[PDB]
């Protein structure tokens, strides 16, 4: 190592962010020529790529402005593009690429590439031995440096590689993070799905649902299992609401022109129609401009009616004729609705109500009529003289109620009059017989809210046919009774009986308009408008769900209600247990609890798209013969495929074989690949037009050796379709190893690397060296015992060492008599010159324990020391005297005193 | 036996109904007599003032005969004098009923059957229901019936006062809309 | 006989500045004017009210500014002129502004945090602060994160961050943002959550011809350019496969699969006509969309990048003719101008393609940079509908591949058969801010009342709000007059110029004739934002090297910067923010529904987006649809 930068001095590049420069700045510098210039200092990321920067400005006068993207290029003379997979299956050998790119004109670089030691990966590199290679990169060229790594534990592991240039001060280090995932599969199961809906099939209290832990039969040990609970709402709203065509009621507009009675007859349909369209907002299809004309006509009719105002604030068709109580009641009722439409005078309404109260008041709650109206059809439902004291007083009370809100401070006697009228109404309510009279009385008494108990039962039972209020008379009477009943039910907030009456009223096909139809049209339109205004679709959700989880001490409370967009709720829990959910409130909801985790890898986890045959044999330069090919399991020949072969270090392909195979049909080799071997040919690519899915008609070729390196990296083979890389099949081969798989000692899912020397070292060894090597920090237990029995297993040799006598006991306080298990490779037996039925002194580390407390199976690694003890009768030999004396002195020294450390 | 549980549930429901429905309703119906007697007295006074007042043209009363005016004034004054004496009886009764209702509400707050809802009666059934049921929470139930009967008597006093007031109240309103039309002295005095 | 008239926007907006125009024909002396606004459902709430005075010094022209304090909402605006009250009903739109969502990266991986920004603007693109609700929805449509933010002193910029859970399904995620006052309108952006590894180079496929002629025996030539993300070229092997697509068809061609050695980042492939015919009649391929999928593998075999271009049209003509920017009505006895738009088969503008008409072939106008050409033809005073055909006259091209388009032009429905016509003409080009447009007004009417017209009232419409209003003076004997209208930054992207004049006819009837024209201006940002490298003499920076960035923009402007790796755009690039998209969105929000005049004055006013109400009875048809008729 001359003129070579030390590995310590080399700094590795780790920061590889996919996006940065997430800063906010304001342009406040002194502008020049209407332009403000701002200078910023930034640090370029270590990643070698093209950075695109987009700037968006928002000025207080110009607005949003997007500038053209700016491209920044980061360049280096020589660099490395370390390619790793996003995730690597645990306990599965994987291959990664370290491609070195050089862009010099006519300079050839002799580079040294090294991989740092990572405890989480079982690579060829060791603490004492460094896995490094030497390569030659010609000018303007890229050279691949594949590396094989076997992941051990899951998590965000890091892989670091370095490259150094000979005779130059150039060095590049690349460190990249990869997420090692435990072997398995992304599988999810539906833990449970239930419906949360109280007040149906529930209980007097609150529904409770207990969700037990999921199965998780194939759950990988020590893997997170996140449980997601989703609460979903179903705000169904469809009751078949039906309106009335606005274009078919155009005949309802009438110009108000008459001597009081006729003027009101004309005006009432217009005002009620205007109110109906205003409530339903049907002016879009009825004519927006016509509303102005309707309002003009309404105000003209109102002024005309005022023209006949009596001195005492009363209303009559003729000034000379005495006023009529029913006529003024209808007057005030009509004016009450039109308060919001036109600029009505509150003084007139107050005077009218005061006159009505003061004329005859309610000494007992009875209204008397003295001046019958000239038009006998105006009364309509009041034509019958049967219990007229009920219908008349109820109608007058309703009229007062409509106008109560406007004129309330001027007259304070309205509440008392209302109470007296009520008391009279309920005084003899049992005597009502006619359906119309009962309906009007119920509607009048419903506004106050004191028509309950037997009154409500009587009102409901009066409904003939369960869906109509019919009497033996004209259709006008039935329509008025139905409107009264609909209004009463709407005021009572009894929605379970509204849809039928509304449906029948819609189906009645009655629009009115003409002679003796003002009352029916007015009432039906008012009832329809009231229903449209007050008809909430469904019961607003009020769910209050409490989730109790044993892991979480505090319950999780969630509220789901309408008009808040909260019908969709999600919760997550890191622990899966037998939790509970308690519902509450009014509404409908559904819970879905689903658990996500990592299932067991099973045995089907393979390539699943190709069956790969790879073999290596010796020659009949070693010049081995290597065979690689694949078979398709499908029903038809696959498309073009690519085979990538990474040869072991020091091995190259045969140029003659490649040249001979190039002319073969159905097979092509790139020209650049053919002319090679100037520096190395580790990576080879073959393009196959098709692969037979029925027979294995493939080839084999010779591979030569040019450089001899100990611990040759196992060769790798990959095959993948040109149109899909996920369906790539990989294999490993090695002349010595059975299938090119790195040796490791594993129990259950816990595996540890085994690519290490069988022992520290073996001669000039003396007592001082033995003492120095026997006093390491890891030296905990030293045993001198006779190895007799040895067992063979399918993975590694097992030796049953019987405790003849204990010299020093470490963490494990084992007495004399028990037997221990030592797991070592069969090959290491010759390295340690172990012999059956012979005495040996061994001591190892404290972290080498394999198994549970009861099962302390030991592992003989590169740190465990084992030495041969000559037999009692074998020390007599002259050459063994020194060794026996040294062993005895070492044993006596440690036993009496022991290693200071 | 389940009969005891049903009776207990019925008694609880009746007590709740009395506490939340009858108690509140009863008080609101006792303070209205005072507001009606004064209102009718004011209306009678206004009617008397309008008769032969600073101006005329008061519908038919303007042309009313001189002799009939004296009788109308006399009867109006008699009715006004008669109706005044009833005010204190209702005024005291209102406050008494309010205080008793407050006490009963406080006492109530201190403390199978569904098919029987047809009874719809919670007037004096608590004590009798407890009587059949017998054949810490029991002690307050004893005075509830007594308080309810006292409230009923207090309300009956005001009801009787209001009913008596009607005798003098109705006569003035009659002669009003009798003379209000074209009715001469004859019928008027004949009925008076 | 004074006549009072009012001009109002067709659609009003809440808490948005609005202007109303008041005018009076044949008025003497000063007159006070009062303006009142009422809410249609109640007609009592007073949203706003203002009054002013009109004087003869301004030729009885007034502008009044009103703003709404803030099931289609409607309002009623009433103007009282002292002796005449004119009330008009106007629809009100609930839209308050625009929301733009900017994402740091187009594609995200599990665990990585997602940082985004929300920009709130008004209909004038100015910064406006308001409460905005934001939701994050997974591909299946289950909102996971919901927030309700507000901006007061942030100049409309709201940054937000979200944490992606470790276990998340792969697919297309969405981020939606909407103003609280307008829950029915939502702006949504879509990004990808898919496992991926950043590549090392970008591959592009470029067809030699943007189209593929049916009779081209040579075939279709496609060049594959693979280049490293840092600029250096790429050498490897590229597999290219062609296919047909009628939308959701994706019919691949197994016989078209080809492999080429990409040397120095260059590779050419040819698709023969015979192969295309065998894959599927020659004339039956019209309308089929060709697509090519190319996969490039490096000689090292360590990285693979897939690039494909889909949607190459197959047409018999290299150019297409459209009349989308041409009025559908003509004035008899007046010259008729067709703004013929020539476009490439893909959709891009043409390249100086001559256009001519079958009749009066002497006219030969070459398309400009915008691809729009003016075709002027003399029209007879006849009243029957006109039929006009447009072809292509490209040189060195046979008649088989020439384009074709026939259209019908209806007569202008004159009111009362008074044969009064007003024509507005403007030269067409890519206008820039600060340029002056010499508009030409021409009048055609009977000589009996040619001395009565004295001025034309003109208005400018842009982004709904009335940009400007004024008068152009006219004198007897001047049939043609020139208006040098000024264009400034307040314009862009497009605006409508309307001009009208009113007169009393033979029967003493108030008749108003109006004409509207469409003016197209080059699309550009209101301000001027530029980002570059501060250093003026330096080599390509090495990793981790300090650099200076120079940003030029308007003073007191909130500037937000973001850096995205180029390799990210290689995989997915559909989600991108640019001024062109903003301008397109703004144009799509225009209330106009015709690129020119209509049937009558009321139709012209309705199309232009303005309601013109007179005191004599003239009025425009009410509009109750937010979107234009389809």
Numbering used by the authors:
A (entry chain B): 752 to 1371, 1381 to 1522, 1525 to 1663
B (entry chain C): 35 to 145, 203 to 226, 256 to 312
C (entry chain A): 23 to 92, 102 to 311, 315 to 664
Can you quote the paper on this entry?
In this work, we report the identification and characterisation of invariant surface glycoprotein 65 (ISG65) from T. b. gambiense as a receptor for C3 and its activation products in human-infective bloodstream forms.
The ISG65:C3 complex could be reconstructed to a reported FSC0.143 of 3.58 Å, while ISG65:C3b was reconstructed to FSC0.143 of 3.59 Å. The higher variance in local resolution across the ISG65:C3b reconstruction is likely caused by increased flexibility of the extended domains CUB and TED relative to the MG-ring. C3b could be modelled except for the flexible regions Asn93-Gly101, Gln312-Leu314, Pro665-Ala667, Ser749-Leu751, Glu1372-Ala1380, and Ser1523-Asp1524. Should this interaction occur in a physiological context, the second attachment point could restrict the free movement of the TED.
